[PDB]
Amino acid sequence: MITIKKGLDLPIAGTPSQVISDGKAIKKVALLGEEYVGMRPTMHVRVGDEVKKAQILFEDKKNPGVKFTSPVSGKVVEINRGAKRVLQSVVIEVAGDDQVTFDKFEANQLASLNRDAIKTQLVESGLWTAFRTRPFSKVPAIDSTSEAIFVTAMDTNPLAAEPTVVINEQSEAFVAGLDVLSALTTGKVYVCKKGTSLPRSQQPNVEEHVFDGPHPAGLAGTHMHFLYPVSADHVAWSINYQDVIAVGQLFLTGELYTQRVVSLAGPVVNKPRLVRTVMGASLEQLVDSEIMPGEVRIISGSVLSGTKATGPHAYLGRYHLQVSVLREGRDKELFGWAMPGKNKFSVTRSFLGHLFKGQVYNMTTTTNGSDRSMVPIGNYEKVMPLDMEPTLLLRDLCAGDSDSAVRLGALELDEEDLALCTFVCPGKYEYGQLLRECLDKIEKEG
Amino acid sequence: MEHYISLLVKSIFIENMALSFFLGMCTFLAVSKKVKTSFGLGIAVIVVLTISVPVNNLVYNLVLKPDALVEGVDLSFLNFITFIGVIAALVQILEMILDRFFPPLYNALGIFLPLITVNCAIFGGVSFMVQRDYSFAESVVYGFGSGVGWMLAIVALAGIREKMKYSDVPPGLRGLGITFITAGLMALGFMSFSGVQL
Amino acid sequence: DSIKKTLFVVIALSLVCSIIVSAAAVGLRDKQKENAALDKQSKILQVAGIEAKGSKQIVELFNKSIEPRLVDFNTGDFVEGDAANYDQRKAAKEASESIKLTAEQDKAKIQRRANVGVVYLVKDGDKTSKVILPVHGNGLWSMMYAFVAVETDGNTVSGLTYYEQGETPGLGGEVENPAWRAQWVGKKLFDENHKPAIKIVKGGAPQGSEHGVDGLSGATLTSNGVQNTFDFWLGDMGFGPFLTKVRDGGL
Amino acid sequence: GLKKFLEDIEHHFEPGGKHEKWFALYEAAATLFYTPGLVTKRSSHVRDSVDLKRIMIMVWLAVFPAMFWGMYNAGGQAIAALNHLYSGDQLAAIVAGNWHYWLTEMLGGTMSSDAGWGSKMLLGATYFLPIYATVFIVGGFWEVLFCMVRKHEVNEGFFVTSILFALIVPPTLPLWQAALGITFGVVVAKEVFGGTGRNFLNPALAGRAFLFFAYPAQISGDLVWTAADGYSGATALSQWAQGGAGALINNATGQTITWMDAFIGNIPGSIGEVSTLALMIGAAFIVYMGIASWRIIGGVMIGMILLSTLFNVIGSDTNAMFNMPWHWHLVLGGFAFGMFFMATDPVSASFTNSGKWAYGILIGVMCVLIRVVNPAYPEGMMLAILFANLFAPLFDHVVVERNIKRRLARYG
Amino acid sequence: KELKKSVLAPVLDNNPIALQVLGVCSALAVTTKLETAFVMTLAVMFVTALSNFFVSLIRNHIPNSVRIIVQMAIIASLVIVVDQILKAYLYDISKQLSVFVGLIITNCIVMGRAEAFAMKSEPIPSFIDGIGNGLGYGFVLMTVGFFRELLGSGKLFGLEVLPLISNGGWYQPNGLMLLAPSAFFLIGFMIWAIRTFKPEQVEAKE
Amino acid sequence: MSTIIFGVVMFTLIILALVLVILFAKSKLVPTGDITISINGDPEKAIVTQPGGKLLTALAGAGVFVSSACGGGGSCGQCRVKIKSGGGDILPTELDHISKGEAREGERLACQVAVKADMDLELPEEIFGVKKWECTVISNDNKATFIKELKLAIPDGESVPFRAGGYIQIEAPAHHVKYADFDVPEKYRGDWDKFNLFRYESKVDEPIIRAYSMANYPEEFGIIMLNVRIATPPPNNPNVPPGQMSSYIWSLKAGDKCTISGPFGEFFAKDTDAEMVFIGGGAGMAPMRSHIFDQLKRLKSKRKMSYWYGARSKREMFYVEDFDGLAAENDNFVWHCALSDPQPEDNWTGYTGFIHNVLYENYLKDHEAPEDCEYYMCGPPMMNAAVINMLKNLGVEEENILLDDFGG
Ligand SMILES: Cc1cc2nc3c(=O)[nH]c(=O)nc-3n(C[C@H](O)[C@H](O)[C@H](O)COP(=O)(O)OP(=O)(O)OC[C@H]3O[C@@H](n4cnc5c(N)ncnc54)[C@H](O)[C@@H]3O)c2cc1C
Ligand SMILES: CCCCCCCC[C@H]1O[C@H]1C/C=C/C=C\[C@H](O)CC(=O)NC1=C[C@](C)(CC)OC1=O
Ligand SMILES: Cc1cc2nc3c(=O)[nH]c(=O)nc-3n(C[C@H](O)[C@H](O)[C@H](O)CO)c2cc1C
Ligand code: FES
Ligand code: FES
Ligand SMILES: [Ca+2]
């Protein structure tokens, strides 16, 4: 067992009840072109075209061979574009039951399969986009291999679903997916989980590793740092439990499996629970008549690392397994910075709120302060468990020194790994964007 | 034993050649960007000084000191030319030796010897040795301590200038002005060993 | 290129440079020595009360009035030698011509003392009006060198002048203040028992003090150095026997 | 009310307005009374409650016991020293000769020896408040000037620099020298480097080192630490260097300085460095909150104890400072003000948990060294913190270079 | 005129100490008083001009193996002559200037001009650029020594212009102006003021 | 007097001793032996040379001509070679044209490489087939007011093997020519005497080397066609010397002789099915004629093509008949021309304005997917900056935009 002690379990209101129910009826889905890192789409559909499930919508110019396929069967109704004609989303209206089908295998043939056949079926079905390479968090090249595939069978995000409830319903598909991954990988598959039991794959290279402690204990970056440190010449792949279930279903049935079980929670949600939905479902229909009145922010994913869902971006992300809704904090308070805070959360001990242990806060989207330079009081060390120097790495990210950033780390990191550092900064810095800029520089300069 | 360690501590701290005596300031203020390069330059300074000061002490005491050869003849007006020629020749010969025989030590520190062949730090060290009338072991210890103090100061300035990657310097001060101000603020801090008589 | 032309060039250049250098360096030695000496000559003429400006008048008056002599510290009797060119500061470090000072004997922290010291007799006609004793001691930052003029009795002070010091220009560098140096005229070096009685007093001196001069203000660590200087150089190891000889008579 | 008045004049200050060039001063007063009211825009849609304002107000509130005790102590020392020297019709002419005295007697207090805690604190305030006001105004001028010319928003941090500079100076500083010192501290040490969070030295002990080297007679000696006209008396790190622990004596009262007197703070010196008890009371609060560094404090303590014990062990028969124990170094001078409030500056210190220990140890070692073996200066804490501010980045360099070799071995 | 450009460009356009870092040691050391700064300016002018002249005379015959030996022989002979002249006539200034009279040999201006310009140019222009670089160096030396001597001691060239309190006046001298960091601060702010008016000298944001 | 002789003799002996000792230390410690330079893998044709010099002069002797544009000195960036074994360490100036990702393979600028140790070079895939020619000028007809077309005849039936978009290098000895020597017809003369640019003249004292892009396609055997713009002093300060080589090629006329050196090039077209959009201007008509004629005639590709040329006036236009003949026989190609200051004599009913505005408002704005085309471009400097900026605001990736700046 690996035990993490430096972190933060966020005490935000609206924790869900881990009971799965049926969600709203969805009539539109979409594929979001800005959430794939370094993706430049070559469109294969026009507004008015009719599509089938698992039918290609666009490809990648910078990643040859990768296909992004439709989750549902219907009609392309919107191709949204933004600044410099950047693709924002391709919206599809759900109508009919059409699909592209593939080959099906027995549950006992999957562990002994050709890597090229597995890769071909994955790329053609469009489920190859479930993987992400570390470093740079990009979809793998269809002609590459990795010696470590990390399965994320846990979750420590705030207001998140609990993977055991979902896996106990698709044990067979989960085991089939692990059996497919054991043949796809060159080496070992790491099923990172909590102490509770899960269905076991029985291939000799599929191993189970238990992680303990608060967030980030459930992020793939921590697992890679502790089990298989990555670098420029050691790359690992990452996949979550629902994508493994989808892989198992694809190889057992010959059909693309597009079924999510997401957590709908937050301080302004009446009944927080797990709901059944579809890949890319419309987030302005999934939350209809389920939130309190007022002005709120709808988020795809966690409040720590997520995308604000407004307008053309208001669809469930690809790598997201939860929806979060919280109020907007736009009040101005007379001497609000000098009040004794019984309702104010902080990692420091400057407020009265920490003296009431077991409290639950109705947190808003407020930035509790103005933008200021970094005065290091030691907050980044309290929340970062990896074996790095937080303050100096963040100052290298700020100053824009890419080389010393790579030396001090920055290649084992995602934008979700600096979410707590963005959280606890007294200068109100956003470090995910600085890390993405440094990684873009490092990937462009050869 | 106490006589030679007090001289070493004095040379390193009480009388710094970088921040107290102001010798070698152009190279000090120009090669202070990276700690690795400053460390290499400081090691080259240590070697050149510890080899240059004793040899010049020997040459002076054998030739140029009053009454060294003939009673009533002192050639103390050849100090400057003799010292500078010996320093230059010694540095060039050491550079060629490192360049041919030991390539790794050449890439390590021999690549700094052109910058040090004729520098004010070594000339001032030899001049101070002549003024202070040192013995041979005293000259060795003094040269070593002086080189070590110069290296310490330049590596500290390099560390500060690397920490300053986050600063926001006015455009007119960017570079030389802010490096001058930083060296002055370093001397203000090194002024703490002033009253010590060691 | 060619070694022959290289050696020709370097040898010709060496000759052309060395001729000029060694001709200029030897042609100016005597002028350099005179310029070095005139500074001490002017300091002594100033401490002796005589007014002089310009090397002409300085040399004239110093040669007509002041007479250097050599005094043996151990017995305080005159010794014959070359007094005009004696170098006490370099003699003090020589092992044969000096003495190492015991920790308790070293009250002024000078750590050594030459066997013979040079004194200067201010002479009017052939009568000895005063004697100028060179004293030195350790202060807070540097070694401080002074010139004290004593009258024939061996007690009364006629002047003081610190010609070398390196103390903070506004705190302990005030030993060069004319208003402080004017306090020394008329003081007494010894008491009724002929023991050192000069006292540097912290916090002002009572008006009418024959033995006390004002200490420096904010500088009690350089004022201690001056006190130690005089305590030593008026003692049994300093100018004590010579000053007793002067008191008895016959400068 | 005040909210309405603030948003109605906001059009005057936006570009093109009647008073646009004074916008940096309006946004400061607008955010001081009311919170900005902004929202998160990209990610981590919930933010921590702490900001620089609370950090600075918490460091500012911690020095109030020390400030008030320092004012009271300055008043009491001045009154005792005055009643020791003068009496009768001399005391009346000395009181009428100084405004610090006749203002204290005008506002209801008394300058006689039967004065209570109320008139002593008044007399100490008549010395502290002008210095604080001058420092604040003259340093804020340069802050606002740099922010206006460079188009920044004025930020807190000088709120702490100004008070920490005003409490580390003798009660009798001239005001023009305080202005010059705060000017050198703010402009040369902080603002030419970018402002708060972007320098490398301690801005308040770099304006005290300006006045210690430039005007050394008004910040040293025996005439500056008790505000009594014509009173000359030494402090206790100067009385120990002269004759040891047997020489610690208060000449104004004719009593021996005990260990409890220096710990409580009944001794002369810099306005607010005298009460170790009050300094500890404030430091415990700012350390509990996580704003100050207990690693730096422990390093300073370890270094002081080690070097003082070594000096006590090896001993000396000509130097009296060789026999000062560790519990006497603690309560004398500005050791505890510096250990607690000035060494713990986050911007000048080290950025690594392993480097903070070495930084504190160097501060303590250098303080004890400059105290004992440097014959010219009674203490060495402004000189030891300024020295360690130069080698703070080298310790981070060593720690990071050790961390990078651990990475390349694929174990980090 | 071809002359005035060559003599007046190294003063502000291509200043030695402020653009070509060469020459900081003597500028930091000898600028506590103004007489020493003047004498050092004149000495550096003389040595640089004549060394450029002679190196440009013999530039064609210098072997590449012993170039440094020959150039330093010329420079050291000139500096020895200068030091022997200073001791005979201006004795007191030499004592205050003790080691930085010899350090004119290793001053970077004298050697960088002999290497960069004198080996490649005729004799009469090398005298000219040596005089011009000496003027550019003396500009900074005199400008720094002015402030240091005025505010540190209240005197200019030894003449009392500000009456000190310990001489019955009103002025209290600044002690840092006689110490080490003051020269660093003065030269830094001077570089700031120079690069403010001529903003083509500003360095890249890197 | 006794001290002077002793001082002189000891001065001279000290200096002579130091010189002799440093010479003797040098004699034993520097090789002066010989090093061998290695090429692709063949034991034959391997260069041995003195350690004095760089890689450029060492490769220059053995008949191996690397692209040495901009007369070396670390400016062009085309003197790049791959070094297998240990050569010399990188220089910060070489980092200007070579990135940290490229340098790993072994790319270094040959100019800054200092030959003192043996090396192993892997030269770029058999470029040993480079020649130095001498040709007879066929014609020097004037194509525009500031552009002249130089034709050359390769002797003895030999033909230059090159690809569309490549360039040759033309070397010229020291000379002196006056702008009155130029044959500038009265059609384009009126603009010259307005500035009286016949005044200027230039002279050089050592030979110069420059590069020029060919204006004919590979299957046009036995000749080389170029477009050479005259490089006159700028208008702000006109007392600067004219263009050295540009004033020479304009001084040539029929029958004269000049020398050229080998086929080079990097501005090659990609082999896909995507649409191509050729943008040109000024002397950039030289590669754009070479690319277009290669596609429609030699390769006979059926891709969709388009050419957008931007001139100042109709007298500034040329090669019109050649393109109008292609647009008639082939229905894949289309041609458009846009003038900045159309005159009444031009009889102009067409596009007016800058070419980056004409291309956008007419064709690209309504295009179904402008990011899917290949853009080739060559023209004046601020025409490249205006077009690239317009294309970036449409979503086009720099991997599609192929730009050949005329030597920066
Ligand atoms: C691969 C390649 C292909 C090319 N193809 C072509 C082509 O097809 N057609 C074409 O026309 N060009 C082409 N060029 C450009 C051409 O080779 C050169 O850019 C240039 O024309 C060389 O001519 P020049 O030496 O006579 O002009 P230069 O002398 O190099 O031009 C210098 C310019 O600056 C001015 N100038 C000169 N000295 C000074 C000074 N001291 N101070 C101020 N101003 C000064 C001159 O008046 C002139 O305008 C190509 C370049 C490359 C690299
Ligand atoms: C050139 C134009 C003329 C100049 C203007 C005329 C002179 C100006 C002079 O009076 C100064 C004030 C300026 C200081 C600024 C800096 C302070 O650090 C800002 C500050 O107090 N911040 C705050 C403190 C607290 C209360 C708690 C942390 O919250 C804050 O808002
Ligand atoms: C614990 C803490 C201690 C501080 N100590 C000082 C100090 O000693 N001197 C000072 O000028 N500012 C001090 N500051 C304020 C701030 O750190 C200082 O202005 C920065 O150095 C500016 O970059 C302190 C701030 C904090 C939070
Ligand atoms: S003076 Fe130029 S380097 Fe020392
Ligand atoms: S110009 Fe020859 S390499 Fe750049
Ligand atoms: Ca003596």
Residues of C in contact with E176 (CB under 8 A): none
Alpha helices (runs of H) in A306-430, residue ranges in sequence order: 379-383, 390-399, 402-408, 419-423
**Nearest chain B Cα distance for residue A404, angstroms:** 11
Query: CA nearest F54: which of F116, F119, F124?
Result: F116
CA E169 to chain centre: 34
Between CA D410 and CA A229 the distance in angstroms is 6
Which DSSP letter does residue F127 get?
A: -
Q: What's the rounded Cα separation, in Å, for the pair D141 and D131?
A: 15
B25 C-beta closer than 6 A to ligand 4: yes
Rounded Cα–Cα distance for residues F47 and F60 (Å)? 10
| Cα–Cα distance measured from residue A219 to residue B26, given in angstroms and rounded to the nearest whole number | 51
How many of the other CB atoms lie within 10 Å of CB of F302?
12
Domain limits, chain A: 2-20+102-253, 22-97, 375-446
Q: Where are the alpha helices (DSSP H) in B10-34?
A: 25-30
Q: Does residue C54 belong to any structural domain of this protein?
A: yes
Residue D188 in contact with residue D292, Cβ under 8 Å?
no
* F289, two tokens: 């004629």
- Largest separation between any pair of C-alpha atoms in chain D: 84
In a domain, C7, yes or no: no
Q: How many CB atoms lie within 10 A of CB D403?
A: 19
Length of chain C: 251
Q: Which two tokens stand for residue A96?
A: 């009919």
Domain that holds residue E58: 1-206
Residues just before a chain gap in chain A (C–N exceeding 2.5 Å) are: none
Task: Say which DSSP state F19 is in.
Answer: H
CB contact (8 A) between residue D36 and residue A419: no
- Chain E, nearest residue to B116 by Cα: E106
Picking from D187, D206, D233, the residue at the C-terminal end of a domain is D233
Do the domain assignments include residue D286?
A: no
Q: How far out from the chain centre does Cα F148 lie?
A: 17
Closest among D352, D342, D338 to D392, alpha carbons compared: D352
Name the residue among D54, D58, D128 with its Cα closest to residue D282: D58
- Residue F76 in marked binding region: yes
Q: b/e per residue, F11-37, with b = 16+ CB within 10 A?
A: bbebbeebbeebeebeeeeeeeeebeb
Backbone angles phi, psi at D34, to 5 degrees: -125, 145
* Angle of the D381-408 helix axis to the D353-372 helix axis, nearest 10: 150
In a domain, C243, yes or no: yes
Neighboring chain A residues of B35 at a CB cutoff of 8 Å? none
User: How many degrees, rounded to 5, is the angle at CA D235 between CA D231 and CA D238?
Assistant: 125
Alpha-carbon distances of F266 from A42, A178, E128, F111, F260, rounded to whole Å? 27, 49, 49, 19, 18
Among F170, F162, F175, F163, residue whose Cα is nearest residue F135: F170
3-state secondary structure of F293: helix
Residue F44, beta-bridge partner list: none
Residue C156 near residue C150 (C-beta atoms within 8 A): yes
Q: Please state the domain count of chain B.
A: 1
Is 1.10.240.10 the CATH number for A22-97? no
C2: in domain: no
Task: Map residue B105 onto helix, strand or coil.
Answer: helix
Burial of A162 (0-12, 13-18, 19+ CB in 10 A): middle
Look up residue F364 and give its amino acid: L
Q: Which two tokens stand for residue E46?
A: 């003389």
Distance separating alpha carbons of residues C16 and D263, to the nearest angstrom: 77
Number of structural domains found in chain D: 2
Give all strands (DSSP E) within chain E, no chain letters: 155-156, 159-160
Residue A292: Cβ within 10 Å count: 12
- Rounded Cα gap, residues D191 and D203, in angstroms: 10
Asked if the bond preceding A216 is cis, omega within 30° of 0, the reply is yes
Domain of residue B124: give its range.
Answer: 1-198
- Let me know the angle formed at the C-alpha of A147 by A144 and A153, rounded to the nearest 5 degrees: 110
Neighbouring residues of D167: CB distance < 8 A, sequence distance ≥ 6: D63, D66, D67, D70, D128, D270, D271, D272, D273, D337
Domain that holds residue C178: 26-251
- Report how far residue B99's alpha carbon sits from residue B90's, in angstroms, rounded to the nearest whole number: 14
Structure tokens at E66: 């012993």
| Min distance E70 CA to chain B CA atoms (Å) | 10
- Whether residue C4 is contained in a domain is answered as no
The tokens for E117 are 């310009």
- What experiment produced this structure? cryo-EM
Give yes or no for residue F69 CB within 6 A of ligand 1: yes
- Which strands form F47-49's sheet, in the order they lie side by side? F47-49, F35-38, F119-120
Work out how many domains chain E is built from and give that number: 1
Distance CA C102, CA C232 (A): 12
Give the DSSP letter string of F227-292: EEE--PPPSSS--S---HHHHHHTT--TT-EEEEEEEE-------SSS-EEEEEEGGGHHHHHHHH
- The chain D residues in contact with chain C (CB within 8 A) are 216-217, 220-223, 232, 375-376
A373 CA closest ligand 3 atom index: 23
Pure H helices in B31-119: 35-59, 79-100, 103-109, 113-116
Which residues on chain A are in Cβ contact (under 8 Å) with B166?
374, 395, 398-399
Cβ C74 vs Cβ C113: under 8 Å: no
Ligand 1 binding pocket includes F144 (Cβ within 6 Å): no
- Give the integer Cα–Cα distance in Å for C76 and A347: 82
Four-residue CA torsion sign, B134, B140, B143, B146 = negative
Length of chain B measured in residues: 198
Per DSSP, what are the bridge partners of residue C150? C131, C157
Question: A79 forms bridges with which residues in the sheet?
Answer: A90
Q: Where do the DSSP E strands lie in E9-77?
A: none
F373 is in an annotated binding site: no
Size of interface B-D (CB pairs under 8 A): 81
Q: Which atom of ligand 1 is nearest to the CA of F70?
A: 53
Separate counts of helices (H) and strands (E) for chain D: 18, 2
F276/F303 Cα distance (integer angstroms): 8
Q: Which two tokens stand for residue D164?
A: 């920490």
Q: Chains with 3 or more CB pairs closer than 8 angstroms to B?
A: A, C, D, E, F
D347 lies in some domain: yes
Q: Which residues contact F286 (CB under 8 A, 6 or more apart)?
A: F212, F213, F214, F215, F225, F226, F227, F378
Q: Give the Cα separation of C194 and C178 in Å (integer).
A: 29
The dihedral of CA D179, D185, D191, D197: what is its sign? Answer: negative
Least CB-CB distance to B77: which of C21, C140, C141? C21
CA distance B65 to B59: 9
Cα angle D38-D40-D42, degrees, rounded to a multiple of 5: 145
Return the ligand number nearest the Cα of D193.
3
Residue B11 DSSP code: I
Residue A251 CB neighbour total at 10 angstroms: 27
CB atoms within 10 A of CB C103: 8
Instruction: Using the structure block, give the residue that is written with the tokens 């403010």.
Output: E196
CB E204 within 8 A of CB D241: no
Q: Do C141 and B195 touch (CB under 8 A)?
A: yes
Terminal CA-to-CA distance of chain C, rounded, Å? 75
The DSSP code for A141 is P
* Residues in chain D closer than 8 A to C221 (CB atoms): 375-376
Tokens of D364: 């303590």
Residue F30 with chain B: CB contacts under 8 Å:
96, 100
DSSP state, D186? I
Find the residue in E nearest to F25 (Cα).
Answer: E65
Q: Which residues pair with A60 in a beta bridge?
A: A41
The closest alpha carbon to D392, from D157, D202, D145, D107, belongs to: D202
How many structural domains comprise chain C?
1
Strands F257-264 and F167-172: antiparallel
Residue of D182, D232, D222, D172 lying closest to D204 (CA atoms): D182
Residue D281 CA to ligand 2 center (angstroms) comes to 28
- Radius of gyration for the alpha carbons in chain E, expressed in angstroms and rounded: 19
Q: Range of D352's domain?
A: 293-408
What CA–CA distance (Å, rounded) separates C171 from A58?
Answer: 84
CB distance B123 to B90 below 8 Å = no
Pair D286, D160: CB distance under 8 Å: no
Whether F64 lines ligand 1, by a CB cut-off of 6 Å, is: no
